[PDB]
Amino acid sequence: ATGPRYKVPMRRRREARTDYHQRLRLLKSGKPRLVARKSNKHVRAQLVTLGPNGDDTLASAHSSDLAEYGWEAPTGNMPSAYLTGLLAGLRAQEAGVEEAVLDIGLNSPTPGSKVFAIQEGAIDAGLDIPHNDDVLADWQRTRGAHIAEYDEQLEEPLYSGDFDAADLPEHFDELRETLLDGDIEL
Amino acid sequence: PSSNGPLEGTRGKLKNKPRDRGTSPPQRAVEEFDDGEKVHLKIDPSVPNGRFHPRFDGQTGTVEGKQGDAYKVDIVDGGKEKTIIVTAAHLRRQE
Amino acid sequence: KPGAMYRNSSKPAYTRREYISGIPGKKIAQFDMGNNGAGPTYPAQVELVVEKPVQIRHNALEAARVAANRYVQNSGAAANYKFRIRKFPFHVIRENKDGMRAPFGKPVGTAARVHGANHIFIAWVNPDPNVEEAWRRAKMKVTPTINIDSSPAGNA
Amino acid sequence: MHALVQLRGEVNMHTDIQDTLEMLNIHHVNHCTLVPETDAYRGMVAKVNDFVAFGEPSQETLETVLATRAEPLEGDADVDDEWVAEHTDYDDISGLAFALLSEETTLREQGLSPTLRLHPPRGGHDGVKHPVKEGGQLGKHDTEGIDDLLEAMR
Amino acid sequence: FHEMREPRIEKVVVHMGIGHANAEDILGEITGQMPVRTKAKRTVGEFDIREGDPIGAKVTLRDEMAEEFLQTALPLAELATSQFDDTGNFSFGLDVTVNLVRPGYRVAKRDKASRSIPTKHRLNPADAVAFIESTYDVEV
RNA sequence: CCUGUCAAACUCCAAACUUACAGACGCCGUUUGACGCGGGGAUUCCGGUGCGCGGGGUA
RNA sequence: AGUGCAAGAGCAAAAGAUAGCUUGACAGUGUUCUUCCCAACGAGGAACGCUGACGCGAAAGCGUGGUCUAGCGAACCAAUU
RNA sequence: UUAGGCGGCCACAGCGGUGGGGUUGCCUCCCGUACCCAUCCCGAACACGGAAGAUAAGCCCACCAGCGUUCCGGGGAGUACUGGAGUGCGCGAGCCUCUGGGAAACCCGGUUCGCCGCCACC
Ligand SMILES: [Cl-]
Ligand SMILES: [Cl-]
Ligand SMILES: [Mg+2]
Ligand SMILES: [Mg+2]
Ligand SMILES: [Mg+2]
Ligand SMILES: [Mg+2]
Ligand SMILES: [Mg+2]
Ligand SMILES: [Mg+2]
Ligand SMILES: [Mg+2]
Ligand SMILES: [Mg+2]
Ligand SMILES: [Mg+2]
Ligand code: NA
Ligand code: NA
Ligand code: NA
Ligand code: NA
Ligand code: NA
Ligand code: NA
Numbered sequence: 001a002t003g004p005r006y007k008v009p010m011r012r013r014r015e016a017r018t019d020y021h022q023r024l025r026l027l028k029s030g031k032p033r034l035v036a037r038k039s040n041k042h043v044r045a046q047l048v049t050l051g052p053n054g055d056d057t058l059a060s061a062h063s064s065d066l067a068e069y070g071w072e073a074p075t076g077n078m079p080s081a082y083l084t085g086l087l088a089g090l091r092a093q094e095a096g097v098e099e100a101v102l103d104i105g106l107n108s109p110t111p112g113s114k115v116f117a118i119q120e121g122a123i124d125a126g127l128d129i130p131h132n133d134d135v136l137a138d139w140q141r142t143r144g145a146h147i148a149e150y151d152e153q154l155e156e157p158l159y160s161g162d163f164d165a166a167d168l169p170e171h172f173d174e175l176r177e178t179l180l181d182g183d184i185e186l
Numbered sequence: 187p188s189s190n191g192p193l194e195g196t197r198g199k200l201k202n203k204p205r206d207r208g209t210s211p212p213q214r215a216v217e218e219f220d221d222g223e224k225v226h227l228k229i230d231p232s233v234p235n236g237r238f239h240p241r242f243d244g245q246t247g248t249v250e251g252k253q254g255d256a257y258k259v260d261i262v263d264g265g266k267e268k269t270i271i272v273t274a275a276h277l278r279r280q281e
Numbered sequence: 282k283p284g285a286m287y288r289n290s291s292k293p294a295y296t297r298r299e300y301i302s303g304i305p306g307k308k309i310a311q312f313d314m315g316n317n318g319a320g321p322t323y324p325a326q327v328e329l330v331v332e333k334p335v336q337i338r339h340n341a342l343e344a345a346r347v348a349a350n351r352y353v354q355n356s357g358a359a360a361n362y363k364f365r366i367r368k369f370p371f372h373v374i375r376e377n378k379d380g381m382r383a384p385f386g387k388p389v390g391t392a393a394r395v396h397g398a399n400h401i402f403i404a405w406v407n408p409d410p411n412v413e414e415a416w417r418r419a420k421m422k423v424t425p426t427i428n429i430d431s432s433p434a435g436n437a
Numbered sequence: 438m439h440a441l442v443q444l445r446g447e448v449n450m451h452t453d454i455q456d457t458l459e460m461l462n463i464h465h466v467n468h469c470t471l472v473p474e475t476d477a478y479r480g481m482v483a484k485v486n487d488f489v490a491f492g493e494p495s496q497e498t499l500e501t502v503l504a505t506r507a508e509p510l511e512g513d514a515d516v517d518d519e520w521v522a523e524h525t526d527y528d529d530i531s532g533l534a535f536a537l538l539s540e541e542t543t544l545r546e547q548g549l550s551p552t553l554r555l556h557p558p559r560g561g562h563d564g565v566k567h568p569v570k571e572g573g574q575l576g577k578h579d580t581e582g583i584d585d586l587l588e589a590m591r
Numbered sequence: 592f593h594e595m596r597e598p599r600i601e602k603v604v605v606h607m608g609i610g611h612a613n614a615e616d617i618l619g620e621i622t623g624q625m626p627v628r629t630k631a632k633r634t635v636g637e638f639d640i641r642e643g644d645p646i647g648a649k650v651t652l653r654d655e656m657a658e659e660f661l662q663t664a665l666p667l668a669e670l671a672t673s674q675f676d677d678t679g680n681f682s683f684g685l686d687v688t689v690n691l692v693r694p695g696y697r698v699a700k701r702d703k704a705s706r707s708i709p710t711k712h713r714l715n716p717a718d719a720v721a722f723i724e725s726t727y728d729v730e731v
Numbered sequence: 732c733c734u735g736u737c738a739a740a741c742u743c744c745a746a747a748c749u750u751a752c753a754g755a756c757g758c759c760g761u762u763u764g765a766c767g768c769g770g771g772g773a774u775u776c777c778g779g780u781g782c783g784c785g786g787g788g789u790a
Numbered sequence: 791a792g793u794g795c796a797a798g799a800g801c802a803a804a805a806g807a808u809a810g811c812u813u814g815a816c817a818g819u820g821u822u823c824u825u826c827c828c829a830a831c832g833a834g835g836a837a838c839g840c841u842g843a844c845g846c847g848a849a850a851g852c853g854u855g856g857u858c859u860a861g862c863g864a865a866c867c868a869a870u871u
Numbered sequence: 872u873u874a875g876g877c878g879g880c881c882a883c884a885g886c887g888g889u890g891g892g893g894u895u896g897c898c899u900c901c902c903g904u905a906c907c908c909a910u911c912c913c914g915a916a917c918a919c920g921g922a923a924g925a926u927a928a929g930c931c932c933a934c935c936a937g938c939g940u941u942c943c944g945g946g947g948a949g950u951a952c953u954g955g956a957g958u959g960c961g962c963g964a965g966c967c968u969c970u971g972g973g974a975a976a977c978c979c980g981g982u983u984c985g986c987c988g989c990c991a992c993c
Binding site for chain 1: 875876877878879880881882884885886896897898899900901904905906907908909917918919920921922923938939940985987988989990991992
């Protein structure tokens with residue numbers, strides 16, 4: 001920018017999107033990466049492989065195409081994350097993918113985080129991923145219990161219209177249950 | 187020379203042009219080669235490990251097995267056959 | 282000492298002051314002479330062109346310059362002309378003043394490397410070339426044969 | 438296709454240059470070879486440029502020399518039309534020459550020694566201290582230029 | 592357009608640059624939350640050679656904690672103009688600094704895809720004076 | 732802004748050229764066995780000169 | 791800028807700074823390069839492995855001392871495990 | 872690709888600047904702290920929960936060359952330098968001719984305001 005000698009960082013570093021030092025440690029395993037990403041409203045889960053002209057995504061799952069299976073709740077929470085994980089985990093299996101390592105990009109390794117939720121789901125789908133059980137949420141929170149109880153302190157619906165007033169961690173089970181057998185795109 | 191260490195007179199060959207300065211792309215440090223391939227040896231000034239002796243910068247050898255993640259490349263120094271322990275980070279496919 | 286000892290450009294360039302100490306100061310008094318307040322707004326422009334690459338010790342630069350400008354007082358101490366010596370003695374020169382043992386000499390002076398055909402002196406005058414004479418005297422005190430060349434001046 | 442004639446000796450000439458003349462089948466002064474105009478051959482004659490004489494000869498000239506200085510891969514046998522006919526693909530010397538010139542075959546391919554060991558130039562050559570452009574006999578020549586040399590050494 | 596262009600107070604830093612403390616206490620009560628030590632850099636003649644060393648405290652207040660504080664701080668200050676930042680900030684007073692900016696600032700403070708705020712979307716000294724002046728007081 | 736100069740231990744640039752490997756042509760080797768492998772016997776380790784490029788030195 | 795110390799070189803979501811935790815400055819055995827271009831030669835040095843035991847980390851992973859190139863020593867005898 | 876995620880090459884992509892875009896859908900800003908988690912002090916950040924509002928940032932789309940960069944034309948320049956040759960010249964420093972290569976600065980005019988891959992998606 002300043003002169004011929006100036007050093008312009010790699011594009012994905014400028015865009016503050018890729019941590020290249022972590023990426024390299026990630027690529028070391030020689031295994032597929034389980035890309036766990038989030039958005040204010042959604043949660044994505046991709047299984048990426050390395051390619052000649054860039055990465056190749058062999059299987060993915062987005063919290064939005066979750067309803068496609070009977071999801072009638074918000075998509076930016078823990079239960080959402082797990083499920084999207086499990087869904088992508090399953091499509092992964094179908095793709096012949098058997099193991100992967102957890103890439104959580106620029107996110108933080110916080111215990112019980114949605115990215116680890118995504119990791120727990122992918123694992124249960126059958127994917128073999130190096131992990132650590134006690135860095136994960138305690139199932140109930142995964143189910144969405146923390147949110148149901150939060151609505152117990154109601155007085156005003158936690159959900160603007162949406163579905164239910166007291167929310168449903170049960171709707172969570174029905175869905176996970178669904179995903180564990182038959183159905184299209186899995 | 188005034189000294190005889192491995193980096194003697196390597197000012198040029200082990201320095202980056204101002205713009206290629208800083209950490210290098212990980213794509214090439216992970217590249218995979220097969221036994222028999224021809225690979226050009228060139229140290230990446232920006233990549234610390236996996237290096238080989240500066241004298242061989244420029245050589246084009248043959249991948250013959252690996253050691254850990256590092257590769258074992260056979261070359262011929264003048265008339266002597268040698269085997270060089272090097273990482274992908276410092277190798278390129280010929281042609 | 283004779284110019285014979287340092288007039289050739291056969292040695293490596295030696296100018297890094299960061300590795301050389303005790304270099305003698307230059308004897309060249311000024312580089313800009315005459316009306317340096319004014320810019321080259323003159324009709325005529327003559328130049329002294331060295332005809333062979335040589336090394337010119339600050340010694341000869343000063344004697345050559347003085348003999349020329351000191352003479353350009355055929356126009357007056359505050360006359361209307363401007364004189365310029367464009368070269369500077371960057372090349373540090375030694376002498377080995379033990380015989381040939383540990384002979385790398387000690388800095389004794391500085392000289393300017395001029396390549397055949399460069400102009401070492403450039404004066405600016407109105408149709409009043411007394412300067413042409415200031416140069417017959419100048420190239421008189423520098424090793425090479427020289428060419429007195431006039432540039433803007435079709436006033437012959 | 439150019440005619441190559443070594444005009445300077447081996448003494449003091451660079452070894453990598455000598456090896457080149459030797460790769461071009463010339464191992465003595467005045468020995469001559471016919472070389473196709475290819476990139477690879479072009480580089481070689483350029484490196485040999487200061488100790489040789491080369492150019493494209495005329496059908497006739499090549500014919501005179503072939504007849505006068507061509508030899509079997511082995512033996513004394515004169516290479517005359519009959520020889521050419523009873524030993525090569527062609528019917529006569531002219532037939533061969535043409536082929537050589539059009540670079541369709543080579544003196545080896547036709548059982549002939551790759552070298553036309555010529556005679557010292559009758560009347561002498563223009564000197565081995567200067568190139569053609571200078572009145573010397575070194576370097577590339579005119580078809581008329583090469584013809585005179587080749588003919589004088591017939 | 593507006594609403595997302597109108598200024599707002601983001602943190603008010605109250606710090607006492609002492610030279611070696613007991614002062615935290617008053618900052619604690621004057622603001623309402625724990626103060627933070629203020630280590631110093633470089634060794635200097637004011638018998639301040641210690642690199643890591645408590646030499647003052649600060650307190651960053653956000654939201655109500657910041658207003659409820661300025662609702663007494665400002666009144667204790669007169670100054671204005673020249674004493675304002677080129678980014679629409681100002682410090683007065685024991686120091687009390689007020690950092691001001693518009694709605695989309697997180698874009699430059701987050702981790703992912705962060706980005707510097709465009710000069711146009713920056714807050715000018717003037718656009719700042721307006722906002723504050725329009726909140727219980729007068730400029731210059 | 733204008734204007735005057737430089738670098739063996741400077742470089743935004745940058746040759747000729749040297750150099751690794753591969754293919755092509757050439758040349759060479761398969762009764763003259765090349766390339767290479769093992770073994771026996773040495774001499775040798777005061778060099779010099781021209782030309783190119785040098786470093787020191789008034790030379 | 792900093793990174794212990796020459797000089798040259800490497801390094802920015804770090805190889806620097808701060809905090810916390812930890813003792814991989816671990817035992818064993820090697821491959822290769824270097825020492826000694828080519829081309830034989832010891833001690834020493836480095837890179838890269840494996841076996842075992844460990845530290846940290848969610849994990850990939852990182853740690854065979856300090857970013858790289860100086861900081862080193864044969865036999866005989868002694869003392870030590 | 873009417874706004875997305877992971878990348879490859881790592882400025883042709885940088886620096887600066889202009890115009891346009893969201894009625895249900897996407898990214899955001901945004902709203903908010905019971906929880907997992909969090910600030911040597913601050914729900915700023917990190918993390919979690921969520922849609923009342925917005926297209927002003929970001930981002931995506933279209934475009935501008937003033938600066939930086941890449942490549943090209945013409946000029947500089949077959950100039951500088953150079954591998955090979957010479958009973959060519961020069962007191963010499965050095966130069967010249969033949970042969971094979973061949974630059975940099977700078978000026979003028981174009982180019983460049985990224986390209987490409989995989990996945991997902993009215
Ligand atoms: Cl994310
Ligand atoms: Cl090596
Ligand atoms: Mg060098
Ligand atoms: Mg015969
Ligand atoms: Mg006679
Ligand atoms: Mg003669
Ligand atoms: Mg060389
Ligand atoms: Mg190290
Ligand atoms: Mg003894
Ligand atoms: Mg002892
Ligand atoms: Mg807009
Ligand atoms: Na790099
Ligand atoms: Na002595
Ligand atoms: Na003279
Ligand atoms: Na050793
Ligand atoms: Na403290
Ligand atoms: Na916008």
